[PDB]
Amino acid sequence: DNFVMPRQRAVTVERERQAGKQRDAYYVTQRVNLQRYFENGVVSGAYAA
Amino acid sequence: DNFVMPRQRAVTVERERQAGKQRDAYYVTQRVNLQRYFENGVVSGAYAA
């Protein structure tokens, strides 16, 4: 529960038809992040060094 | 009446979508000029010195 991902825009596939070049360009963008409410709730384990 | 408004095209708004930069480009243009039939008809009063 401590960690939540925020999002401004989802995954969007917008196509652009270039003409002088016969190719069609596809653009996919996304606005996301990962933050936690408070500074706790995650613990890591590592080998003995 | 000595002055005129030579005009070719009026004020036009062109909307362009540039998907590569994901900008909306807006262009406004017009073609105008100022002319007089004869080389006279004006007078201006300036300050001293």
Burial class (CB in 10 A: 0-12, 13-18, 19+), B47: exposed
16-45 in chain B: CB under 8 A from chain A:
19-20, 22
Size of interface A-B (CB pairs under 8 A): 11
Q: Which residues of A touch B19 (CB under 8 A)?
A: 14-16, 25, 27
Residue type, A35: Q
User: Resolution of the coordinates in A?
Assistant: 2.9
- Tokens, residue A43: 């613990």
Start-to-end Cα distance in chain B: 33
Q: How many CA atoms lie within 13 A of A33 on its CB side?
A: 5
